[PDB]
Amino acid sequence: VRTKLPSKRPFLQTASHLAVNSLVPSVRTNRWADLIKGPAVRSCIPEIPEVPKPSEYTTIGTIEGPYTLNLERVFGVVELAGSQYKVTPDDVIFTNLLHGIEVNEVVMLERVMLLGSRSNTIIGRPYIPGACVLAAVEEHFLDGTVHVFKRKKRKRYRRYKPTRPMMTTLRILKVLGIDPAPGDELGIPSGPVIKITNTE
Amino acid sequence: FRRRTWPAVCGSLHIWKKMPWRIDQAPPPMPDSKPLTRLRAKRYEGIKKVVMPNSTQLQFGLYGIRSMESARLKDNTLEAIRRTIRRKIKKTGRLWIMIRATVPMTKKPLGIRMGKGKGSIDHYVTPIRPGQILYEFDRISRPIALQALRAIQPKLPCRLGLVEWS
Amino acid sequence: TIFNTGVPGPRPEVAQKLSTEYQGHILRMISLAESASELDEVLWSSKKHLRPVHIARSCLKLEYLRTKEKGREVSEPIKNLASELENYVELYSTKFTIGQVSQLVRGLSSIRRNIQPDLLLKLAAVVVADDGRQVQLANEMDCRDLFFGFFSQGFDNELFWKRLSESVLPRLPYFNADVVSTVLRVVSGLRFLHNTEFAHATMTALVPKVGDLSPARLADAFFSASLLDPTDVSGLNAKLEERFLREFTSFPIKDTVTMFQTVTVRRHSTPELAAQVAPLVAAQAHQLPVRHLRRALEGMVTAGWKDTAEIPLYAILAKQAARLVLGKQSAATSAILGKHVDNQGYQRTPVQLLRQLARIFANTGLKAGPGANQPLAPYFAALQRELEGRLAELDEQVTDDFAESFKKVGIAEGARVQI
Amino acid sequence: VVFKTTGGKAWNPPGGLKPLTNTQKRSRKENLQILLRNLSVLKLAAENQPEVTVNLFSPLKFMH
RNA sequence: AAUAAAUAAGUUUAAUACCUUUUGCAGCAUGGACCAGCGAUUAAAUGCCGGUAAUUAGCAAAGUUAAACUAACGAAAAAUA
RNA sequence: UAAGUCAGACGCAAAGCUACAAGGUUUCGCGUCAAAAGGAAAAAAGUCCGCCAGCGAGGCUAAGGUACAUAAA
RNA sequence: UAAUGUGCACCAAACAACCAGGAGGUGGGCUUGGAAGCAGCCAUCCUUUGAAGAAAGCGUAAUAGCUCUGCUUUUUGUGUAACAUUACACUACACGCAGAAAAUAAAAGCCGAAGCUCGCUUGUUCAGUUAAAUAU
RNA sequence: CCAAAGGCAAAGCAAACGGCAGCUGUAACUCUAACGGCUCUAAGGUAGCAAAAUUCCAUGGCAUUUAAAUGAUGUCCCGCAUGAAUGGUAUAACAACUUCUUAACUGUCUCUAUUCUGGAUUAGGCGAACUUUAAAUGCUUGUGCAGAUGCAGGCUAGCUAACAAGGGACGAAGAGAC
RNA sequence: GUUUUUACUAAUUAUAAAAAAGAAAAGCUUAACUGCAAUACAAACAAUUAAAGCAGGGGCAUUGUCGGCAAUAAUGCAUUGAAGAAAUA
RNA sequence: CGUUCUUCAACCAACGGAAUAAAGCUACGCUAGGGAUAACAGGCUUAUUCGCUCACAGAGUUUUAUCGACGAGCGCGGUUGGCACCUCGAUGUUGGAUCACCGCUUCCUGUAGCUGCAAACGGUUAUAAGGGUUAGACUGUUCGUCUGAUAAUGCGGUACGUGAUCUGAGUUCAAAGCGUCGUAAGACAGUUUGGUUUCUAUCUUUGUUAGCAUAAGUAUUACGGCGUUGUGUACAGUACGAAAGGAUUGUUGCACAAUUAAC
RNA sequence: UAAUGCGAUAAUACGCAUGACGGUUCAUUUUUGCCGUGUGUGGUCACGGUAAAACUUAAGAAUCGUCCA
Ligand SMILES: [K+]
Ligand SMILES: [K+]
Ligand SMILES: [K+]
Ligand SMILES: [K+]
Ligand SMILES: [K+]
Ligand SMILES: [K+]
Ligand SMILES: [K+]
Ligand SMILES: [Mg+2]
Ligand SMILES: [Mg+2]
Ligand SMILES: [Mg+2]
Ligand SMILES: [Mg+2]
Ligand SMILES: [Mg+2]
Ligand SMILES: [Mg+2]
Ligand SMILES: [Mg+2]
Ligand SMILES: [Mg+2]
Ligand SMILES: [Mg+2]
Ligand SMILES: [Mg+2]
Ligand SMILES: [Mg+2]
Ligand SMILES: [Mg+2]
Ligand SMILES: [Mg+2]
Ligand SMILES: [Mg+2]
Ligand SMILES: [Mg+2]
Ligand SMILES: [Mg+2]
Ligand SMILES: [Mg+2]
Ligand SMILES: [Mg+2]
Ligand SMILES: [Mg+2]
Ligand SMILES: [Mg+2]
Ligand SMILES: [Mg+2]
Ligand SMILES: [Mg+2]
Ligand SMILES: [Mg+2]
Ligand SMILES: [Mg+2]
Ligand SMILES: [Mg+2]
Ligand SMILES: [Mg+2]
Ligand SMILES: [Mg+2]
Ligand SMILES: [Mg+2]
Ligand SMILES: [Mg+2]
Ligand SMILES: [Mg+2]
Ligand SMILES: [Mg+2]
Ligand SMILES: [Mg+2]
């Protein structure tokens, strides 16, 4: 046992049992545990149902030409690309890369959590049904280079890996769901002309 | 849990099984008058921390003194305690001594580096186990026993208590 | 050195799902599944990594599994699994390829499941989108499944068939004979394609190469050609008949029966042909389903063959029909085994088929009631027992039709058959 | 843990290992409750074991 | 260790060079004032083990060199005649 | 892999040697460092929690905390 | 040493304190130039009985005397080298100090990592078995 | 003193190379041993000198020298381990040799002060060298490859240099000699 | 080495070996062999340790045992040299 | 002449044994390397050393006034040791000169108790670190012995403080002598005489001064530096005491010394 | 296991003779302590072991003594 050579005892025992089984047949021929083994199942408990959520973003049309925007007196909170944003018309936000949309398209955001004005507030638990936010896709860009560097002193170890993140830019156009307080109504045209191209 | 293999459970060669002295619970025997040995020992032989059995009592006297902690006492300490007890109690007192220093200890002189073998004997010691009875008295009164206990307590490194037969 | 004593015990049994490393083994696992329950578990464990290729292949596997249960109703687990695969198809409705759609339709059609009308339109749009650009990439096997798969589903969109036919027309001369035969089957089944240029092109493409047709496809081609082209404008029906005469002995029993009936419809039957058919049909009468038994009776009756002492074919057919209706084969096997409690699945024949068989036997000219042991006695005796348990399905018109057949054969006393 | 109080390496502040605070005591109480609770559950499972063991599906076992 | 991440631009927070050598170095352990140029597992013969091909190789030109191969127990009976 | 390595260190727990000393020395069981960034204890190779493919102004926790420095009763 | 708790022991008077006696055989016998209670031994008995040891101690050459174990009223929780817990001390950061503050939370809760998780990015890991037309 | 182990030579040679003991008893009181006994060797150190340029106990004991002497001179002496041509003991003269003392003299000192000449220091001209990983380079205690300008706590708030001093930068010079 | 007898059950450098076993006493003997060997213990390698069984010639018994000694120490590779025998040239 | 089988022997005991065999000196030394490894200093440890508490035995003999022990515990980092953690591409040795900062375990100058304290001279405990802590003979010394004075001539830490400020007597290179050891080269860890001590200050620390930056003068308060010393004598031969001897007290008086400030 | 066991001529034909009292030697795991492993701020944790060591009350068996209550 003092020796560090690996032991061959398991190999010697296996060769003996194999030789006996090869030449001498067994007496028993059944095993009850195998006979009554039931079918394989996925689990022993009912599955847990999932909680529905409103749609994140969907296209509704395109923008035809240059437009202008004016300031309004309402705001809201919307969930998008894993993070929440407080938005009001004519704001610009930066998110992760969104797939399936193009520049000069109008999208609809439905995961609205809070709506507010100067006279009332509406709180979602956790979402408000019947509210939405409209925005225009303005950019799909690569952000500034981020330089990633690692080194270990005195270990001859060095790594350099520059990278460029992908992001998307949006401009908020309209917030729907809550009326402005009395005297705060915008009584003039505000947004662009939208060509509707999404009928379900 | 016991650390042995399957062949050992069946064909062990350790037929005559003795419990090691360090953990044996048997009470120590009465001291004898044999001469001190001149054979060096190992340090474990002078230390034993396992408690005494739960049936220990006085064997000869009516009063005694016991140790509440383990300790290692030298021959010099025992002689000083013996004189103190003899003077404190009386000339006409019956005393039983249940301990004796028998385990040699070695030491090396100043200015010697590590190595070149073990040293030579310097003195003798004895291990003390918790709850052990050290001295017994007879032909005295209880107040005299308490005086003996207080006299020796400052001279020992372990806590002491009084035992009475009933 | 030693921290545990004893022999290592059995490993714990852990429920696990498929990991991303084994996403390439999903197609293999589908093939290795040997039952509906196993396939259901394979799909469930791989739910997070399912793709349109996997959904289409699973539906095709339903046909392979159901084949092992021939002669019985579709099992409940197969129906339940099909109800789930349909939902997946709806999610991936617009991401399938032309080759994958063909597999999906064939599998669901084989199980005799009706796809929703909206799904068929979406699936149809995929095939014919972009002016049939992808049709030029579908191979022969894909084309064969597309034609038969959609036809079996009852799809009746004129625009879809018009565009599909136009794209396939230039490729007909290079398709195999078996593929062309399937196209003819669809053309004959669709009324609005009866007299189109595509229909004529198909016939002209099949004539040059007929020696490669298999027995099953050969019979269908003759049936379709006769219906579409009663007059031999193209030398197809004449060539098909010549092949039937030359290799009549080599074809299987089912195809010979079907082809013989077609000849009688064509009015080219002869007493010599009828005499030759009888010995072969009598020997292998037990290898003909109820549908082919009806064809055999009509063909022989039209040919004019009369019952002979050496080969009483009509008597044998009547007994065989009774066995199929009663399903005595399962009971007979159980008698030898000794366990009569064995479950016996069956596919009950429709009442319409029962009436058609009864009329044919009546027109045969043989009696069943008067004589104690008549050739047609066993069939009518079985019919009475079956109808006793199907009185709810019996209607006034059905009762009258059977009564006419009963009167013709010679049983009109309102009493059960002797046997 | 470190109990040694000698040497130049200051594992503990001067004075040795410090006594536990009230929060540390509460932390150790909850760690032991979890351990005791696990043992109580295993006792319930043993007293309510079925006659036939359930068979659970595994893709890797299926392949081989 | 003279920078980094931020900011209402006022400021706030994080943060003891590199190499060599060591059980362990901000090291009060070793080397470098800075810039440009020069400066260190290369070639031959032979052997072993993988990969890629030819399907023996070299001369000569119906004949010669090199390599490789060359006896182990002649053991099957599948005829619905 | 016919490669590199044959200078090891400490914590908790034992035994021999030393003086039941040493950040001492010799064996042995587990862990960490060596070759391991991040968080807590003041700075913190070896203790406690825990193993860094990359980016983000999202969320829940571990050890440890919850009048100021300093996030939270 | 101190603080707290447990065990045990004692408003028929516990504990602290004021008010009176501590007698006679006796100054027991012995030793002694002196011993009575105290230079030193034997002895430690008797009586009065409101108490008292042949006086606990200070001293007197012996005396005398005080007060002490024990005595009546009077006002009046205590004791305990028994045990357990907590926190301190037994003498040199010999250049210069661990912040401010501090007589009340192991609480419903919450803070807290490059751990887990959410959004985005990079690399890595061919098969086709069905025929379900009622035509004369 | 030529034995043993060598060298040389005419079988001999020591001013060739070399060596030259120990134990024990004894004289009036004491002490000592003039005087005996024994063992061994080739031979057993004779005269002379001796706290040494040679002495471990040690700053040996006594006398002179000073107010005070690990000093100097003399002297006592089996001297750890002196000794007679690797010479022993003395010796007038001589010595930029080592040691102690006397006379005189003095800033060597109590205790320093003033001053002259030159340099430093101020101005013009001319014009090097050691050194340098990068610097915008405080104190104190704690920490740590175990003695910190650079890490943690407690402190520190006009700016750049000149003349002067030399605690620290484990200060510079020479790949530690031990 | 091996057979027989019984008023015996020890000793070793050290040691709870051993009763169908040993020691002593009596008799006969040379297996303290020739040529091989399955399978294991151990072990970096070299070597080191135990051993059923087959053939030949023997010993004591009369069908069992003997390839030295109760067991655990008494040792030394290759090279070079030497001796007995045998086969070549 | 060569090969095989059966066998043995020698040196391998540094016992895996082979370059056939086979001793020393170096202070005249040289090269390549290590803080992987010693000598000086730092660090860890505290056996030893030193201090305190308990212990109150024993001497004193009423007193734990004073002296003082067996034994046990704790503390200090200054004595003798142990370990090998930092430095060998260099961290200058002992003692002294010069100039210093700190602790208190107090030698003198203070404060308060006890005493086997009449006075004087003392003993011991608690508290107190402002000032002071001498000149010489011997010795390279630290130390130690001695002499004349002094209020008294304390101990320890600071790289056993201090050589980019000085010294070089000892120790520790090359020369030489003596004694002892070695056949010899040589060695002493014994002794004696002789024997080279470099540096122009860049950063930080410190003493002075000028320029520049918010006009000048007077400036309470605050902050920082410095540290208010010692001896003799008179008030008195008085208190005390048989005699002898001989004081206490003071924002005291007077003379002198050191230190500091100037002139 | 009375075809037993023991014996003083010790051989076994003969001697004692299987009961009853007394003294010796050999169950709720008796249930406490203690030990081992894992985890651990050094124990308000878990499981197992003691046919290795201390510790309870029985009942039976093997000798031995005995004119027997
Ligand atoms: K430069
Ligand atoms: K000479
Ligand atoms: K001279
Ligand atoms: K300097
Ligand atoms: K060797
Ligand atoms: K060095
Ligand atoms: K003082
Ligand atoms: Mg340290
Ligand atoms: Mg927690
Ligand atoms: Mg090192
Ligand atoms: Mg350099
Ligand atoms: Mg090595
Ligand atoms: Mg090693
Ligand atoms: Mg170590
Ligand atoms: Mg390394
Ligand atoms: Mg939270
Ligand atoms: Mg806060
Ligand atoms: Mg992660
Ligand atoms: Mg001489
Ligand atoms: Mg001379
Ligand atoms: Mg000048
Ligand atoms: Mg420091
Ligand atoms: Mg600092
Ligand atoms: Mg060097
Ligand atoms: Mg081997
Ligand atoms: Mg034999
Ligand atoms: Mg043998
Ligand atoms: Mg060797
Ligand atoms: Mg050198
Ligand atoms: Mg080192
Ligand atoms: Mg080491
Ligand atoms: Mg003091
Ligand atoms: Mg000093
Ligand atoms: Mg010094
Ligand atoms: Mg200096
Ligand atoms: Mg010399
Ligand atoms: Mg000489
Ligand atoms: Mg000589
Ligand atoms: Mg000279």
SS (H, E, C) chain C: CCCCCCCCCCCCCCCCCCCHHHHHHHHHHHHHCCCHHHHHHHHHHCHHHCCHHHHHHHHHHHHHHHHCCCCCCCCHHHHHHHHHHHHHHHHCCCCCCHHHHHHHHHHHHHCCCCCCHHHHHHHHHHHHHHHHCHHHHCCHHHHHHHHHHHHHCCCCCHHHHHHHHHHHHHHHHHCCHHHHHHHHHHHHHCHHHCCCHHHHHHHHHHCCCCCCCCHHHHHHHHHHHHHHCCCCCCCCHHHHHHHHHHCCCCCCHHHHHHHHHHHHHHCCCCHHHHHHHHHHHHHCHHHCCHHHHHHHHHHHHHHCCCCCCCCCHHHHHHHHHHHHHHCHHHHHHHHHHCCCCCCCCCCCCCHHHHHHHHHHHHHHCCCCCCCCCCCCHHHHHHHHHHHHCCCCCCCHHHHHHHHHHHHHHCCCCCCCCCC
Ligand 3 centre from A6 Cα, in Å? 88
Q: Residues B75, B77, B82, B87: is their CA dihedral positive or negative?
A: positive
CB atoms within 10 A of CB B147: 13
Task: Specify the length of chain B in residues.
Answer: 166
For residue C45, list chain A residues with Cβ-Cβ distance below 8 A.
42
Q: Which burial class, exposed, middle or buried, applies to A82 when counting CB atoms under 10 A from its CB (0-12, 13-18, 19+)?
A: exposed
Task: Round to whole Å and give the CA distance between A77 and A84.
Answer: 7
β-sheet with A75-80: strand ranges across: A83-87, A75-80, A112-116, A121-123
Task: Round to whole Å and give the CA distance between A97 and B117.
Answer: 79
Backbone φ and ψ of A86, nearest 5°: -100, 120
State the number of CA atoms in the 13 A half-sphere of A89 facing the CB. 18
User: Rounded to the nearest 10 degrees, how much is the dihedral formed by the CA atoms of C188, C190, C192, C195?
Assistant: -10
Neighbours of C, requiring at least 3 CB pairs below 8 Å, are A, B, D
Task: Round to whole Å and give the CA distance between A173 and A170.
Answer: 9
- The two counts, helices (H) then strands (E), for chain A are 2, 12
Q: Choose among B71, B70, B76, B84: nearest CA to B124.
A: B76
Q: Choose among C168, C230, C238, C228: nearest CA to C199.
A: C228
Residue pair C348/C290 in contact (Cβ under 8 Å)? The answer is: no
**Both tokens assigned to A8:** 């061959």
Tell me, what DSSP letter sits at residue A45?
S
Task: Round to whole Å and give the CA distance between C228 and C187.
Answer: 9
Please report the number of interchain residue pairs, chain A to chain C, with beta-carbon separation below 8 angstroms: 9
D52 touching A (Cβ < 8 Å): yes
Who contacts D39 (Cβ-Cβ below 8 Å, separation ≥6)? none
The CA R_g of chain A, rounded to the nearest whole Å, is 33
Spacing of A154 CA from H173 C1' in Å: 31
Backbone φ and ψ of C393, nearest 5°: -75, -20
Q: Which of residues 2-41 of A touch strand I (CB under 7 A)?
A: 2-5, 8-9, 12
Q: Which burial class, exposed, middle or buried, applies to D57 when counting CB atoms under 10 A from its CB (0-12, 13-18, 19+)?
A: buried
Instruction: Please give the protein residue whose CA is closest to the C1' of the nucleotide F58.
Output: A83
Task: Round to whole Å and give the CA distance between D22 and C192.
Answer: 91
Residue pair A144/A162 in contact (Cβ under 8 Å)? The answer is: no
**Both tokens assigned to C409:** 């054969």
Who contacts C418 (Cβ-Cβ below 8 Å, separation ≥6)? C369, C372, C377, C381
Tell me whether residues C37 and A43 touch, CB distance under 8 A: no
Query: Which residue do the tokens 């019979």 mark?
Result: C219
Tell me whether residues D52 and A36 touch, CB distance under 8 A: yes
Tell me whether residues D57 and C15 touch, CB distance under 8 A: yes
Residue pair A133/A78 in contact (Cβ under 8 Å)? The answer is: yes
Nearest-by-Cβ selection for C16 from D53, D55, D59: D59
Q: Partners of A174 in the beta sheet?
A: A134
Tell me, what DSSP letter sits at residue B43?
G
Spacing of B120 CA from J181 C1' in Å: 36
Backbone φ and ψ of C237, nearest 5°: -60, -40
Q: Partners of A41 in the beta sheet?
A: D56
Protein contacts of strand J with Cβ less than 7 Å away: B 74, 76-77, 79-81, 83-84, 87, 110-114, 151, 154-157; D 6-8
Backbone φ and ψ of C64, nearest 5°: -65, -45
Residue pair B61/B138 in contact (Cβ under 8 Å)? The answer is: yes
Distances in Å between the alpha carbon of C122 and those of C59, C117, C128, C135?
Answer: 17, 9, 10, 16
Backbone φ and ψ of B13, nearest 5°: -85, -5
Q: Choose among D53, B49, B85, C210: nearest CA to A34.
A: D53
Q: Choose among C217, C236, C227, C215: nearest CA to C191.
A: C227
Q: Choose among C207, C108, C223, C222: nearest CA to C154.
A: C108
Neighbours of A, requiring at least 3 CB pairs below 8 Å, are C, D
Q: Choose among C344, C277, C269, C259: nearest CA to C317.
A: C277
Strand K nucleotides in reach of protein CB atoms, 7 A cut-off: 32-38, 40-42, 44-49, 52-55
The CA R_g of chain B, rounded to the nearest whole Å, is 20
**Both tokens assigned to A129:** 């049904």
Question: Among all strands, which nt has the closest C1' to B51 (CA)?
Answer: K34
Tell me whether residues C29 and D63 touch, CB distance under 8 A: yes
Three-state DSSP at A47 gives: coil
**Both tokens assigned to C81:** 């699994």
Q: Which of residues 146-175 of A touch strand E (CB under 7 A)?
A: 151, 153-154, 156
Tell me whether residues D62 and C38 touch, CB distance under 8 A: yes
Tell me whether residues A41 and D55 touch, CB distance under 8 A: yes
Q: Choose among A94, A86, A101: nearest CA to A133.
A: A86
Residue pair C322/C386 in contact (Cβ under 8 Å)? The answer is: no
Query: Which residue do the tokens 């007293």 mark?
Result: D47
Residue pair C56/C28 in contact (Cβ under 8 Å)? The answer is: no
Rounded to a whole number of angstroms, the distance from the CA of D63 to the nearest CA of chain A is 14
Task: Specify the length of chain A in residues.
Answer: 200
Residue pair A119/A181 in contact (Cβ under 8 Å)? The answer is: yes
Residue pair C57/C30 in contact (Cβ under 8 Å)? The answer is: yes
Tell me whether residues D55 and A36 touch, CB distance under 8 A: no
CB atoms within 10 A of CB C138: 22
Experimental structure resolution, Å: 3.2
Tell me, what DSSP letter sits at residue A14?
H
**Both tokens assigned to A116:** 């507010």
Tell me whether residues C14 and D63 touch, CB distance under 8 A: no
Three-state DSSP at B103 gives: strand
Residue pair A53/A111 in contact (Cβ under 8 Å)? The answer is: yes
Nearest-by-Cβ selection for A41 from D52, D56, D62: D56
Residue pair C297/C263 in contact (Cβ under 8 Å)? The answer is: no
Rounded to a whole number of angstroms, the distance from the CA of C2 to the nearest CA of chain B is 7
Spacing of A1 CA from I31 C1' in Å: 37
Who contacts A23 (Cβ-Cβ below 8 Å, separation ≥6)? none
For residue A129, cis peptide bond before it (omega within 30 degrees of 0)? no
What string of DSSP letters covers A55-76? --EEEEEEE-S-------S-EE
Nearest-by-Cβ selection for D58 from C14, C28, C29: C14
Query: What residue of D is the nearest CA neighbor of A41?
Result: D56
Three-state DSSP at A157 gives: strand
Query: Which residue do the tokens 């009329």 mark?
Result: C359
